[PDB]
Design an enzyme around this catalytic site. Structure first.
Site, PDB file in Angstrom:
ATOM      1  N   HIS A  41     -46.651  80.556 -14.619  1.00 45.34           N
ATOM      2  CA  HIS A  41     -46.293  79.164 -14.208  1.00 45.34           C
ATOM      3  C   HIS A  41     -46.684  78.870 -12.758  1.00 45.34           C
ATOM      4  O   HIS A  41     -46.509  77.690 -12.338  1.00 45.34           O
ATOM      5  CB  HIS A  41     -44.844  78.798 -14.537  1.00 45.34           C
ATOM      6  CG  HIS A  41     -43.815  79.471 -13.701  1.00 45.34           C
ATOM      7  ND1 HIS A  41     -43.015  80.459 -14.208  1.00 45.34           N
ATOM      8  CD2 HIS A  41     -43.413  79.263 -12.438  1.00 45.34           C
ATOM      9  CE1 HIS A  41     -42.179  80.861 -13.276  1.00 45.34           C
ATOM     10  NE2 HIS A  41     -42.419  80.161 -12.175  1.00 45.34           N
ATOM     11  N   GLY A 143     -38.863  79.781  -5.091  1.00 40.22           N
ATOM     12  CA  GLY A 143     -39.799  80.627  -4.317  1.00 40.22           C
ATOM     13  C   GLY A 143     -39.681  82.097  -4.697  1.00 40.22           C
ATOM     14  O   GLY A 143     -40.554  82.880  -4.275  1.00 40.22           O
ATOM     15  N   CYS A 145     -39.761  83.543  -7.784  1.00 41.52           N
ATOM     16  CA  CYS A 145     -40.534  83.952  -8.974  1.00 41.52           C
ATOM     17  C   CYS A 145     -41.608  84.962  -8.569  1.00 41.52           C
ATOM     18  O   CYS A 145     -42.235  84.794  -7.521  1.00 41.52           O
ATOM     19  CB  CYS A 145     -41.117  82.761  -9.719  1.00 41.52           C
ATOM     20  SG  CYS A 145     -39.768  81.779 -10.425  1.00 41.52           S
TER      21      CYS A 145
HETATM   22  C1  LIG Z   1     -39.821  80.105  -9.894  1.00 45.65           C
HETATM   23  O1  LIG Z   1     -40.668  79.137 -10.517  1.00 45.65           O
HETATM   24  C2  LIG Z   1     -40.227  80.031  -8.433  1.00 45.65           C
HETATM   25  O2  LIG Z   1     -39.567  80.701  -7.673  1.00 45.65           O
HETATM   26  N1  LIG Z   1     -41.241  79.152  -7.912  1.00 45.65           N
HETATM   27  C3  LIG Z   1     -41.683  78.968  -6.519  1.00 45.65           C
HETATM   28  C4  LIG Z   1     -42.814  78.114  -7.102  1.00 45.65           C
HETATM   29  C5  LIG Z   1     -42.197  78.196  -8.509  1.00 45.65           C
HETATM   30  C6  LIG Z   1     -38.365  79.610 -10.162  1.00 45.65           C
HETATM   31  C7  LIG Z   1     -37.151  80.456  -9.764  1.00 45.65           C
HETATM   32  C8  LIG Z   1     -35.813  79.729 -10.038  1.00 45.65           C
HETATM   33  C9  LIG Z   1     -35.525  78.479  -9.190  1.00 45.65           C
HETATM   34  C10 LIG Z   1     -34.022  78.490  -8.907  1.00 45.65           C
HETATM   35  N2  LIG Z   1     -33.694  79.901  -9.054  1.00 45.65           N
HETATM   36  C11 LIG Z   1     -34.592  80.595  -9.788  1.00 45.65           C
HETATM   37  O3  LIG Z   1     -34.437  81.735 -10.201  1.00 45.65           O
HETATM   38  N3  LIG Z   1     -38.280  79.340 -11.604  1.00 45.65           N
HETATM   39  C12 LIG Z   1     -38.256  78.098 -12.109  1.00 45.65           C
HETATM   40  O4  LIG Z   1     -38.180  77.071 -11.437  1.00 45.65           O
HETATM   41  C13 LIG Z   1     -38.410  78.016 -13.614  1.00 45.65           C
HETATM   42  C14 LIG Z   1     -39.796  77.498 -13.964  1.00 45.65           C
HETATM   43  C15 LIG Z   1     -39.623  76.157 -14.662  1.00 45.65           C
HETATM   44  C16 LIG Z   1     -38.146  75.837 -14.717  1.00 45.65           C
HETATM   45  N4  LIG Z   1     -37.491  77.022 -14.153  1.00 45.65           N
HETATM   46  C17 LIG Z   1     -36.177  77.241 -14.073  1.00 45.65           C
HETATM   47  O5  LIG Z   1     -35.738  78.284 -13.628  1.00 45.65           O
HETATM   48  C18 LIG Z   1     -35.260  76.122 -14.553  1.00 45.65           C
HETATM   49  N5  LIG Z   1     -34.464  76.652 -15.632  1.00 45.65           N
HETATM   50  C19 LIG Z   1     -34.541  76.149 -16.856  1.00 45.65           C
HETATM   51  O6  LIG Z   1     -35.180  75.154 -17.154  1.00 45.65           O
HETATM   52  C20 LIG Z   1     -33.706  76.892 -17.905  1.00 45.65           C
HETATM   53  F1  LIG Z   1     -33.443  78.095 -17.484  1.00 45.65           F
HETATM   54  F2  LIG Z   1     -32.567  76.293 -18.088  1.00 45.65           F
HETATM   55  F3  LIG Z   1     -34.368  76.947 -19.063  1.00 45.65           F
HETATM   56  C21 LIG Z   1     -34.419  75.465 -13.442  1.00 45.65           C
HETATM   57  C22 LIG Z   1     -35.363  75.025 -12.326  1.00 45.65           C
HETATM   58  C23 LIG Z   1     -33.700  74.232 -14.012  1.00 45.65           C
HETATM   59  C24 LIG Z   1     -33.357  76.398 -12.861  1.00 45.65           C
HETATM   60  C25 LIG Z   1     -40.127  77.336 -15.430  1.00 45.65           C
HETATM   61  C26 LIG Z   1     -39.249  77.874 -16.540  1.00 45.65           C
HETATM   62  C27 LIG Z   1     -41.621  77.381 -15.716  1.00 45.65           C
END
Ligand SMILES: *[C@](O)(C(=O)N1CCC1)[C@H](C[C@@H]1CCNC1=O)NC(=O)[C@@H]1[C@@H]2[C@H](CN1C(=O)[C@@H](NC(=O)C(F)(F)F)C(C)(C)C)C2(C)C
Ligand SMILES: *[C@](O)(C(=O)N1CCC1)[C@H](C[C@@H]1CCNC1=O)NC(=O)[C@@H]1[C@@H]2[C@H](CN1C(=O)[C@@H](NC(=O)C(F)(F)F)C(C)(C)C)C2(C)C
Ligand SMILES: [Cl-]
Lengths: 306, 306
Positions: A41, A143, A145
């Site tokens: 992602h 951030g 991930c």
């Molecule tokens: C991860 O993408 C990241 O760290 N990024 C920096 C650029 C992208 C992130 C980690 C998350 C954010 C909050 N705490 C974490 O552990 N993961 C996501 O944002 C993740 C990406 C989207 C939606 N994500 C979710 O974790 C969401 N959860 C859900 O939709 C669900 F778990 F309910 F299904 C949210 C943002 C609502 C917590 C994808 C799954 C691709």
């Protein structure tokens, strides 16, 4: 003496963390030999994450669209492919800090250390369990991930988790390093909930052995039980069935303390039935289930890594 | 989201650990530039430790009596001196892995990470607090002496603790890296007990802010209090006085959540007076006091190290 939630030393894994950026999406990657592993992602916009077609998003990208930074050095990407939910970026430079390593898929109930990272840099280290419902109770912000989970055996890093997402209740979901999710989760921003979690019975017994080794012995009763009678009682309290394999794994702790596993089962049954009566065990008012039998032995016998 | 007891990444400190042997006594040393720091009781036999005269024991030793090993490499010792309760061995080789570093003496209530080591090799990492009674609640076995405690700020390792001994209750005592003990303890195998410990009030308030940030808000009441009335109530429950400096340090968390420090004090007073009524806060049935205000901010804002 003393008993703490102890993480593996993180040095071998700190030397593998890089920052990966695609467009305006930045997260962490794991650089082993000439390959950078990260969550697929990274190729999504915010928009895309509601319902991404990853194969479609990836055909539109070329090597040069992936920016990989290791400190103040950019690594030239010279190949890319998707394996399940992880992206593999072949780079022109082998990481000289690559430890001896393996990829493992762990079982529910197993523990590992997480090196929480942002922009390719470590924030902290803590110990987690793969819950029976295939979530982990982590500490992760936007951030994070691409942060990984690992065990160390002597000199060998077994990578078992890469972080992808946060579920309701603020619990976490991710993949093995072949990009297969633990549990039924998908890398899409849509309604998903964890199944109801269970208590990891074998880990609670391991921690009661740790309590005995530390001289916290008040909960030991004068009874034994059968595995059968223990499992009928524990089921009511949302405890995992204890199998003969679990009993066999508890053998080393049982032998060290001289307390048969089924005698400790009788002590645990009484704690489940009567509660702790305002008492603590190793400083805790609740029974702990995120120490494995191996975790107790490594901490109480001082196992080191090279 | 999520809130875990998080340690600093240990890589910078793993590169400084060596094994030091004198006669048949082996423990850990810290190799920074061309100096190895270790507990002075490396120069004792078991016999000696009941009532050692360290100055006498050390005049009888020369450089070549100290064996220092960094992996499969022996470091030639070319000078030795004693500073308070720590031995400094000058070696012929500067550690090329020496991070940017400082020696600090921490205050009671401050936290740090411990890298538990045996024979110069890391076993694990965990977070500790310097207790008001100048003990730490560690996890240490025979062979762990010379393991160190540290904080990291950006790229700089602040070393604050070196491990020397275990007291009754299985709590731990040691020195700063100038070899001065925390608390009234001495490096002699004789009857010593810790003073009665206190709860670090400012850290309990920091953790209640962490609970609010994570959405665990049930304990918030509709009242404020004065610092004076809060301190008269807390004293009964063996809580530290909360000073104006403590209130000022809680400012960033107070501002982030919009909850005034004295309103959180009113919530904590009610928890102390009424108990938690079978409820948990961030998964705990007891109030936690080993997170500093800075620990909460670093975990909840994702501060990293380079
Ligand atoms: C991860 O993408 C990241 O760290 N990024 C920096 C650029 C992208 C992130 C980690 C998350 C954010 C909050 N705490 C974490 O552990 N993961 C996501 O944002 C993740 C990406 C989207 C939606 N994500 C979710 O974790 C969401 N959860 C859900 O939709 C669900 F778990 F309910 F299904 C949210 C943002 C609502 C917590 C994808 C799954 C691709
Ligand atoms: C430390 O010496 C060590 O690790 N060594 C390997 C060669 C020496 C060791 C660490 C201890 C052992 C158990 N857990 C620990 O944290 N420290 C000592 O053995 C310490 C040395 C002697 C006596 N020490 C004690 O810790 C003792 N405590 C006390 O006498 C007292 F705390 F009550 F005062 C014992 C061994 C009884 C726990 C000296 C203080 C020089
Ligand atoms: Cl608890």
């Amino acid at each position: 003496s003393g008993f703490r939630k102890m993480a593996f030393p993180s040095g071998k894994v700190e030397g593998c963390m890089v920052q990966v950026t695609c467009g305006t999406t930045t997260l962490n990657g794991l650089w082993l030999d000439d390959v950078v592993y990260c969550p697929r992602h990274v190729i999504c916009t915010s928009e895309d994450m509601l319902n991404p077609n990853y194969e479609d998003l990836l055909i539109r990208k070329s090597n040069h669209n992936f920016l990989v930074q290791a400190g103040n050095v950019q690594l030239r990407v010279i190949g890319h492919s998707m394996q399940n939910c992880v992206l593999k970026l072949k780079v022109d430079t082998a990481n000289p800090k690559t430890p001896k390593y393996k990829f493992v898929r762990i079982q529910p109930g197993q523990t590992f250390s997480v090196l929480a990272c942002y922009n390719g840099s470590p924030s902290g280290v803590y110990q987690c369990a793969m819950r029976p419902n295939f979530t982990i109770k982590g500490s992760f912000l936007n951030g994070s991930c691409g942060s990984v989970g690992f065990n160390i055996d002597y000199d060998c890093v077994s990578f078992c988790y890469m972080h992808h997402m946060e579920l309701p209740t603020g619990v976490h979901a991710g993949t093995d390093l072949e990009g297969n999710f633990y549990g039924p989760f998908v890398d899409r921003q849509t309604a998903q909930a964890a199944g109801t979690d269970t208590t990891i019975t074998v880990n609670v017994l391991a921690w009661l052995y740790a309590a005995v080794i530390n001289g916290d012995r008040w909960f030991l009763n004068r009874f034994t039980t059968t595995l059968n009678d223990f499992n009928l009682v524990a089921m009511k309290y949302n405890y995992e069935p204890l199998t003969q394999d679990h009993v066999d794994i508890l053998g080393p702790l049982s032998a060290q303390t001289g307390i048969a596993v089924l005698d400790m089962c009788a002590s645990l049954k009484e704690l489940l039935q009567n509660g702790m009566n305002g008492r603590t065990i190793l400083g805790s008012a609740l029974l702990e289930d995120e120490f494995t039998p191996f975790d107790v032995v490594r901490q109480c016998s001082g196992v080191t890594f090279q």
